[PDB]
Design an enzyme around this catalytic site. Sequence first.
Site, mmCIF file in Angstrom:
data_model
loop_
_atom_site.group_PDB
_atom_site.id
_atom_site.type_symbol
_atom_site.label_atom_id
_atom_site.label_comp_id
_atom_site.label_asym_id
_atom_site.label_seq_id
_atom_site.Cartn_x
_atom_site.Cartn_y
_atom_site.Cartn_z
ATOM 1 N N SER A 64 0.797 -1.228 0.000
ATOM 2 C CA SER A 64 0.000 0.000 0.000
ATOM 3 C C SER A 64 0.826 1.274 0.000
ATOM 4 C CB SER A 64 -0.932 0.049 1.204
ATOM 5 O OG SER A 64 -2.158 -0.564 0.889
ATOM 6 N N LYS A 67 0.356 3.535 -2.969
ATOM 7 C CA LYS A 67 -0.658 4.585 -3.032
ATOM 8 C C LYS A 67 -0.026 5.966 -3.042
ATOM 9 C CE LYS A 67 -4.400 2.165 -0.507
ATOM 10 N NZ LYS A 67 -3.643 0.879 -0.370
ATOM 11 N N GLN A 120 -10.527 -3.950 0.357
ATOM 12 C CA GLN A 120 -10.111 -4.570 -0.893
ATOM 13 C C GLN A 120 -11.314 -4.793 -1.802
ATOM 14 O OE1 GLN A 120 -7.012 -4.584 -1.385
ATOM 15 N NE2 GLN A 120 -5.884 -5.182 0.476
ATOM 16 N N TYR A 150 -10.705 3.285 4.941
ATOM 17 C CA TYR A 150 -9.511 3.008 4.160
ATOM 18 C C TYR A 150 -9.806 1.927 3.127
ATOM 19 C CZ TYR A 150 -4.574 1.896 3.297
ATOM 20 O OH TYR A 150 -3.351 1.626 2.741
ATOM 21 N N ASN A 152 -8.562 0.307 -0.856
ATOM 22 C CA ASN A 152 -7.782 0.184 -2.082
ATOM 23 C C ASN A 152 -8.640 0.395 -3.327
ATOM 24 O OD1 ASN A 152 -4.780 -0.827 -1.674
ATOM 25 N ND2 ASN A 152 -6.031 -1.686 -0.015
ATOM 26 N N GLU A 265 -0.298 9.900 5.288
ATOM 27 C CA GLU A 265 -0.893 10.311 6.542
ATOM 28 C C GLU A 265 -0.006 11.377 7.173
ATOM 29 O OE1 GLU A 265 -1.059 6.506 8.438
ATOM 30 O OE2 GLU A 265 -2.603 5.769 7.068
ATOM 31 N N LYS A 305 3.638 6.348 6.044
ATOM 32 C CA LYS A 305 2.749 5.388 5.409
ATOM 33 C C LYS A 305 3.306 3.993 5.650
ATOM 34 C CE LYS A 305 -0.874 4.182 3.077
ATOM 35 N NZ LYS A 305 -0.840 2.998 3.981
ATOM 36 N N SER A 308 2.004 -3.248 3.088
ATOM 37 C CA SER A 308 2.309 -4.678 3.116
ATOM 38 C C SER A 308 1.766 -5.363 1.868
ATOM 39 C CB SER A 308 1.721 -5.378 4.353
ATOM 40 O OG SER A 308 2.195 -4.815 5.561
#
Length: 352
Positions: A64, A67, A120, A150, A152, A265, A305, A308
Amino acid sequence: NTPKDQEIKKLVDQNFKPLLEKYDVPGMAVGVIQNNKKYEMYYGLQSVQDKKAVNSSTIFELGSVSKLFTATAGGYAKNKGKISFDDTPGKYWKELKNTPIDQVNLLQLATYTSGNLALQFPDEVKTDQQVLTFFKDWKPKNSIGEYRQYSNPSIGLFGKVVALSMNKPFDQVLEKTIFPALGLKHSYVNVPKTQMQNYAFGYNQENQPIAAPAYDVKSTLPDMLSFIHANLNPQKYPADIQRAINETHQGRYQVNTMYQALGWEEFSYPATLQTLLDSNSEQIVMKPNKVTAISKEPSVKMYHKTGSTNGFGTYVVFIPKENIGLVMLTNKRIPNEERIKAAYAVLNAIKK
Protein backbone atom coordinates in the site's frame (compact mmCIF):
# COMPACT_ATOMS: atom_id res chain seq x y z
CA ASN A 1 34.19 10.74 18.50
CA THR A 2 31.92 8.43 16.47
CA PRO A 3 31.26 9.28 12.80
CA LYS A 4 27.65 10.07 11.97
CA ASP A 5 27.26 7.11 9.58
CA GLN A 6 28.27 4.76 12.41
CA GLU A 7 25.93 6.46 14.89
CA ILE A 8 22.99 5.98 12.53
CA LYS A 9 24.05 2.40 11.76
CA LYS A 10 24.22 1.73 15.51
CA LEU A 11 20.69 3.10 16.02
CA VAL A 12 19.32 0.96 13.19
CA ASP A 13 21.15 -2.04 14.66
CA GLN A 14 19.65 -1.41 18.10
CA ASN A 15 16.08 -0.91 16.92
CA PHE A 16 15.58 -2.69 13.59
CA LYS A 17 18.03 -5.60 13.69
CA PRO A 18 16.29 -7.39 16.63
CA LEU A 19 13.15 -7.54 14.48
CA LEU A 20 14.94 -9.93 12.11
CA GLU A 21 15.30 -12.57 14.82
CA LYS A 22 12.03 -11.74 16.59
CA TYR A 23 9.91 -12.15 13.44
CA ASP A 24 12.19 -14.56 11.51
CA VAL A 25 12.58 -12.01 8.71
CA PRO A 26 15.03 -13.20 6.01
CA GLY A 27 15.97 -9.78 4.64
CA MET A 28 15.60 -6.09 5.41
CA ALA A 29 16.74 -2.77 3.98
CA VAL A 30 16.68 0.35 6.19
CA GLY A 31 17.56 3.77 4.83
CA VAL A 32 17.92 7.14 6.55
CA ILE A 33 18.26 10.48 4.82
CA GLN A 34 19.32 13.45 6.95
CA ASN A 35 20.38 16.84 5.61
CA ASN A 36 20.52 15.35 2.10
CA LYS A 37 22.93 12.63 3.25
CA LYS A 38 21.73 9.07 2.64
CA TYR A 39 22.60 6.10 4.84
CA GLU A 40 21.79 2.59 3.62
CA MET A 41 21.70 -0.48 5.85
CA TYR A 42 21.09 -3.97 4.46
CA TYR A 43 20.44 -7.15 6.44
CA GLY A 44 19.93 -10.74 5.56
CA LEU A 45 18.95 -12.40 2.33
CA GLN A 46 16.75 -11.37 -0.57
CA SER A 47 16.45 -15.08 -1.43
CA VAL A 48 17.07 -17.60 1.32
CA GLN A 49 17.55 -20.61 -0.96
CA ASP A 50 19.95 -18.67 -3.20
CA LYS A 51 21.92 -17.24 -0.24
CA LYS A 52 21.66 -13.92 -2.10
CA ALA A 53 22.24 -11.02 0.27
CA VAL A 54 19.99 -7.97 0.40
CA ASN A 55 21.82 -5.07 -1.21
CA SER A 56 21.32 -1.73 -2.98
CA SER A 57 19.93 -3.54 -6.04
CA THR A 58 17.30 -5.61 -4.17
CA ILE A 59 13.73 -4.96 -5.38
CA PHE A 60 10.97 -5.18 -2.73
CA GLU A 61 7.19 -4.97 -3.08
CA LEU A 62 5.79 -1.77 -1.58
CA GLY A 63 2.23 -2.91 -1.00
CA SER A 64 0.00 0.00 0.00
CA VAL A 65 2.95 2.39 -0.02
CA SER A 66 2.27 2.25 -3.78
CA LYS A 67 -0.66 4.58 -3.03
CA LEU A 68 1.87 7.37 -2.48
CA PHE A 69 2.80 7.18 -6.17
CA THR A 70 -0.85 7.12 -7.21
CA ALA A 71 -1.36 10.23 -5.08
CA THR A 72 1.70 11.89 -6.63
CA ALA A 73 0.43 11.05 -10.13
CA GLY A 74 -2.92 12.64 -9.28
CA GLY A 75 -1.22 15.75 -7.94
CA TYR A 76 0.72 15.87 -11.20
CA ALA A 77 -2.31 15.54 -13.48
CA LYS A 78 -4.21 18.06 -11.36
CA ASN A 79 -1.50 20.68 -11.71
CA LYS A 80 -1.00 19.96 -15.41
CA GLY A 81 -4.72 20.80 -15.68
CA LYS A 82 -5.70 17.25 -16.65
CA ILE A 83 -8.14 16.79 -13.74
CA SER A 84 -9.90 18.76 -11.05
CA PHE A 85 -10.31 17.13 -7.65
CA ASP A 86 -13.97 18.29 -7.77
CA ASP A 87 -14.54 16.21 -10.92
CA THR A 88 -16.46 12.95 -10.73
CA PRO A 89 -15.08 9.75 -12.31
CA GLY A 90 -17.74 9.75 -15.04
CA LYS A 91 -16.00 12.69 -16.70
CA TYR A 92 -13.07 10.41 -17.62
CA TRP A 93 -14.45 6.85 -17.41
CA LYS A 94 -17.49 7.47 -19.60
CA GLU A 95 -19.22 4.19 -18.71
CA LEU A 96 -19.54 5.53 -15.15
CA LYS A 97 -21.56 8.61 -16.12
CA ASN A 98 -25.18 8.51 -14.81
CA THR A 99 -24.21 5.87 -12.20
CA PRO A 100 -24.21 6.08 -8.38
CA ILE A 101 -20.42 6.26 -8.12
CA ASP A 102 -20.57 9.38 -10.34
CA GLN A 103 -21.75 11.34 -7.27
CA VAL A 104 -18.30 10.91 -5.65
CA ASN A 105 -15.60 13.39 -6.58
CA LEU A 106 -11.96 12.53 -7.19
CA LEU A 107 -10.71 13.90 -3.87
CA GLN A 108 -13.26 11.79 -1.98
CA LEU A 109 -12.12 8.68 -3.85
CA ALA A 110 -8.47 9.53 -3.15
CA THR A 111 -9.17 10.05 0.57
CA TYR A 112 -11.51 7.08 1.16
CA THR A 113 -14.78 8.92 1.79
CA SER A 114 -17.16 7.46 -0.81
CA GLY A 115 -19.18 5.97 2.06
CA ASN A 116 -19.27 2.42 0.70
CA LEU A 117 -15.90 1.05 -0.43
CA ALA A 118 -14.18 -1.70 1.51
CA LEU A 119 -10.48 -2.30 2.16
CA GLN A 120 -10.11 -4.57 -0.89
CA PHE A 121 -11.99 -5.54 -4.01
CA PRO A 122 -13.88 -8.84 -3.73
CA ASP A 123 -11.51 -11.73 -4.45
CA GLU A 124 -13.27 -12.40 -7.77
CA VAL A 125 -12.73 -8.87 -9.17
CA LYS A 126 -9.73 -9.35 -11.47
CA THR A 127 -10.80 -8.62 -15.05
CA ASP A 128 -10.55 -4.94 -15.93
CA GLN A 129 -14.20 -5.34 -17.00
CA GLN A 130 -15.08 -6.80 -13.60
CA VAL A 131 -13.76 -3.56 -12.09
CA LEU A 132 -16.06 -1.53 -14.34
CA THR A 133 -18.92 -3.87 -13.40
CA PHE A 134 -18.07 -3.49 -9.70
CA PHE A 135 -18.28 0.30 -9.92
CA LYS A 136 -21.34 0.21 -12.18
CA ASP A 137 -23.00 -2.00 -9.53
CA TRP A 138 -21.79 0.22 -6.68
CA LYS A 139 -24.41 1.90 -4.52
CA PRO A 140 -23.97 4.49 -1.75
CA LYS A 141 -24.36 3.55 1.92
CA ASN A 142 -23.03 6.13 4.36
CA SER A 143 -23.37 9.76 3.30
CA ILE A 144 -20.77 10.60 0.66
CA GLY A 145 -17.80 12.53 2.08
CA GLU A 146 -18.49 12.07 5.80
CA TYR A 147 -16.85 8.74 6.71
CA ARG A 148 -13.29 7.64 6.04
CA GLN A 149 -13.00 3.94 5.29
CA TYR A 150 -9.51 3.01 4.16
CA SER A 151 -9.98 1.42 0.76
CA ASN A 152 -7.78 0.18 -2.08
CA PRO A 153 -10.72 0.21 -4.55
CA SER A 154 -11.33 3.87 -3.66
CA ILE A 155 -7.90 5.22 -4.51
CA GLY A 156 -7.64 2.58 -7.27
CA LEU A 157 -10.55 4.23 -9.07
CA PHE A 158 -8.81 7.55 -8.49
CA GLY A 159 -5.65 6.22 -10.16
CA LYS A 160 -7.66 4.81 -13.06
CA VAL A 161 -9.21 8.26 -13.61
CA VAL A 162 -5.76 9.86 -13.41
CA ALA A 163 -4.36 7.57 -16.11
CA LEU A 164 -7.34 8.20 -18.39
CA SER A 165 -6.85 11.96 -18.01
CA MET A 166 -3.26 11.48 -19.24
CA ASN A 167 -4.33 9.09 -22.06
CA LYS A 168 -1.96 6.33 -20.93
CA PRO A 169 -2.16 3.05 -19.01
CA PHE A 170 -1.57 3.68 -15.32
CA ASP A 171 1.67 1.68 -15.27
CA GLN A 172 2.98 3.90 -18.07
CA VAL A 173 1.97 6.99 -16.08
CA LEU A 174 4.38 5.88 -13.36
CA GLU A 175 7.13 4.26 -15.42
CA LYS A 176 7.29 6.89 -18.20
CA THR A 177 6.23 10.07 -16.35
CA ILE A 178 6.25 9.97 -12.55
CA PHE A 179 9.25 7.74 -11.82
CA PRO A 180 11.54 9.64 -14.25
CA ALA A 181 10.40 13.02 -12.91
CA LEU A 182 11.38 11.81 -9.44
CA GLY A 183 14.73 10.44 -10.59
CA LEU A 184 13.77 6.85 -9.75
CA LYS A 185 15.75 4.39 -11.89
CA HIS A 186 14.77 1.03 -10.31
CA SER A 187 11.07 1.42 -9.56
CA TYR A 188 8.51 -0.58 -11.50
CA VAL A 189 4.92 -1.60 -11.82
CA ASN A 190 6.17 -4.53 -13.92
CA VAL A 191 9.68 -5.74 -13.10
CA PRO A 192 11.51 -6.45 -16.38
CA LYS A 193 13.04 -9.87 -17.03
CA THR A 194 16.53 -8.33 -16.83
CA GLN A 195 15.82 -7.33 -13.21
CA MET A 196 14.31 -10.59 -11.95
CA GLN A 197 17.59 -11.66 -10.35
CA ASN A 198 17.20 -8.55 -8.13
CA TYR A 199 13.54 -9.18 -7.27
CA ALA A 200 13.45 -10.38 -3.66
CA PHE A 201 11.44 -13.44 -2.76
CA GLY A 202 8.61 -12.58 -0.42
CA TYR A 203 8.20 -14.89 2.57
CA ASN A 204 4.94 -15.89 4.22
CA GLN A 205 4.34 -16.54 7.90
CA GLU A 206 5.78 -20.07 7.45
CA ASN A 207 8.93 -18.53 5.85
CA GLN A 208 8.02 -20.10 2.54
CA PRO A 209 9.00 -18.05 -0.53
CA ILE A 210 5.93 -16.79 -2.35
CA ALA A 211 -6.00 -6.98 -11.39
CA ALA A 212 -4.77 -3.99 -13.43
CA PRO A 213 -6.47 -1.45 -11.10
CA ALA A 214 -4.45 -3.18 -8.36
CA TYR A 215 -1.72 -0.56 -8.74
CA ASP A 216 1.39 -1.98 -7.04
CA VAL A 217 4.94 -0.69 -7.17
CA LYS A 218 8.27 -2.44 -6.69
CA SER A 219 11.35 -0.49 -5.64
CA THR A 220 14.83 -0.49 -4.10
CA LEU A 221 16.05 1.25 -0.98
CA PRO A 222 18.05 3.84 -3.00
CA ASP A 223 14.97 4.70 -5.04
CA MET A 224 12.84 5.02 -1.90
CA LEU A 225 15.47 7.23 -0.27
CA SER A 226 15.35 9.34 -3.43
CA PHE A 227 11.55 9.45 -3.23
CA ILE A 228 11.85 10.62 0.38
CA HIS A 229 14.43 13.20 -0.76
CA ALA A 230 11.88 14.48 -3.28
CA ASN A 231 9.27 14.82 -0.53
CA LEU A 232 11.78 16.61 1.71
CA ASN A 233 12.98 18.90 -1.12
CA PRO A 234 10.20 19.60 -3.62
CA GLN A 235 11.84 22.89 -4.58
CA LYS A 236 14.72 20.92 -6.15
CA TYR A 237 12.38 19.43 -8.77
CA PRO A 238 10.71 20.65 -11.97
CA ALA A 239 7.56 22.72 -11.53
CA ASP A 240 5.10 19.98 -12.48
CA ILE A 241 6.42 17.26 -10.17
CA GLN A 242 7.16 19.88 -7.48
CA ARG A 243 3.51 20.95 -7.45
CA ALA A 244 2.53 17.28 -7.61
CA ILE A 245 4.46 16.48 -4.43
CA ASN A 246 3.17 19.53 -2.56
CA GLU A 247 -0.36 18.46 -3.50
CA THR A 248 0.17 15.13 -1.74
CA HIS A 249 1.35 16.97 1.40
CA GLN A 250 -1.85 18.99 1.91
CA GLY A 251 -3.97 17.63 4.74
CA ARG A 252 -7.60 17.33 3.66
CA TYR A 253 -9.47 16.44 6.86
CA GLN A 254 -8.75 14.93 10.27
CA VAL A 255 -9.67 11.79 12.15
CA ASN A 256 -8.59 12.60 15.72
CA THR A 257 -4.82 13.36 15.64
CA MET A 258 -4.34 12.06 12.08
CA TYR A 259 -4.51 14.32 9.04
CA GLN A 260 -5.38 12.56 5.79
CA ALA A 261 -3.25 13.95 2.99
CA LEU A 262 -3.08 12.41 -0.49
CA GLY A 263 -1.72 8.92 0.13
CA TRP A 264 0.36 10.20 3.00
CA GLU A 265 -0.89 10.31 6.54
CA GLU A 266 0.04 13.58 8.21
CA PHE A 267 0.61 14.51 11.85
CA SER A 268 1.59 17.50 13.92
CA TYR A 269 5.29 17.32 14.78
CA PRO A 270 6.50 16.44 17.31
CA ALA A 271 4.10 13.49 17.20
CA THR A 272 3.70 11.25 20.22
CA LEU A 273 4.41 7.58 19.51
CA GLN A 274 0.80 6.73 20.36
CA THR A 275 -0.46 9.28 17.79
CA LEU A 276 1.54 7.39 15.14
CA LEU A 277 0.35 4.01 16.48
CA ASP A 278 -3.29 5.17 16.57
CA SER A 279 -3.10 5.82 12.81
CA ASN A 280 -2.63 2.08 12.31
CA SER A 281 -5.17 0.93 14.92
CA GLU A 282 -7.91 -1.44 13.82
CA GLN A 283 -10.37 1.40 14.56
CA ILE A 284 -8.67 3.70 12.04
CA VAL A 285 -7.56 1.12 9.46
CA MET A 286 -10.47 -1.33 9.42
CA LYS A 287 -13.57 0.66 10.42
CA PRO A 288 -15.41 3.74 9.15
CA ASN A 289 -14.72 6.96 11.05
CA LYS A 290 -16.49 10.30 10.78
CA VAL A 291 -14.05 12.88 9.41
CA THR A 292 -13.77 16.45 10.68
CA ALA A 293 -12.47 19.61 9.09
CA ILE A 294 -8.90 20.57 9.80
CA SER A 295 -8.85 23.02 12.69
CA LYS A 296 -5.14 23.26 13.51
CA GLU A 297 -3.31 23.58 10.20
CA PRO A 298 -0.02 21.99 11.34
CA SER A 299 2.88 24.35 10.69
CA VAL A 300 5.49 21.75 11.67
CA LYS A 301 4.47 18.29 10.56
CA MET A 302 5.48 14.79 9.60
CA TYR A 303 4.16 12.15 7.25
CA HIS A 304 4.21 8.39 7.18
CA LYS A 305 2.75 5.39 5.41
CA THR A 306 2.80 1.67 6.16
CA GLY A 307 2.45 -0.90 3.42
CA SER A 308 2.31 -4.68 3.12
CA THR A 309 1.90 -7.57 0.69
CA ASN A 310 1.63 -11.25 1.66
CA GLY A 311 5.45 -11.52 1.64
CA PHE A 312 6.67 -7.92 2.18
CA GLY A 313 6.48 -5.01 4.60
CA THR A 314 7.24 -1.33 4.07
CA TYR A 315 7.34 1.78 6.21
CA VAL A 316 8.19 5.30 5.06
CA VAL A 317 8.26 8.38 7.28
CA PHE A 318 9.68 11.85 6.88
CA ILE A 319 9.83 15.13 8.80
CA PRO A 320 10.39 18.15 6.52
CA LYS A 321 11.60 20.66 9.07
CA GLU A 322 13.99 18.15 10.63
CA ASN A 323 15.27 17.44 7.09
CA ILE A 324 15.11 13.72 7.83
CA GLY A 325 13.31 10.59 6.74
CA LEU A 326 13.46 6.82 6.95
CA VAL A 327 12.47 3.83 4.81
CA MET A 328 12.15 0.21 5.97
CA LEU A 329 11.68 -2.62 3.48
CA THR A 330 11.39 -6.31 4.41
CA ASN A 331 10.68 -9.52 2.53
CA LYS A 332 8.46 -10.74 5.36
CA ARG A 333 5.53 -8.94 6.98
CA ILE A 334 6.10 -7.74 10.54
CA PRO A 335 3.45 -5.95 12.63
CA ASN A 336 2.92 -2.32 11.59
CA GLU A 337 3.30 -1.24 15.22
CA GLU A 338 6.86 -2.63 15.28
CA ARG A 339 7.84 -0.70 12.15
CA ILE A 340 6.47 2.53 13.61
CA LYS A 341 8.11 1.98 17.00
CA ALA A 342 11.53 1.17 15.56
CA ALA A 343 11.50 4.17 13.21
CA TYR A 344 10.32 6.49 15.99
CA ALA A 345 13.17 5.31 18.24
CA VAL A 346 15.75 5.84 15.47
CA LEU A 347 14.51 9.23 14.27
CA ASN A 348 14.27 10.68 17.78
CA ALA A 349 17.75 9.47 18.78
CA ILE A 350 19.66 10.67 15.69
CA LYS A 351 21.72 13.72 16.64
CA LYS A 352 20.16 16.84 15.13
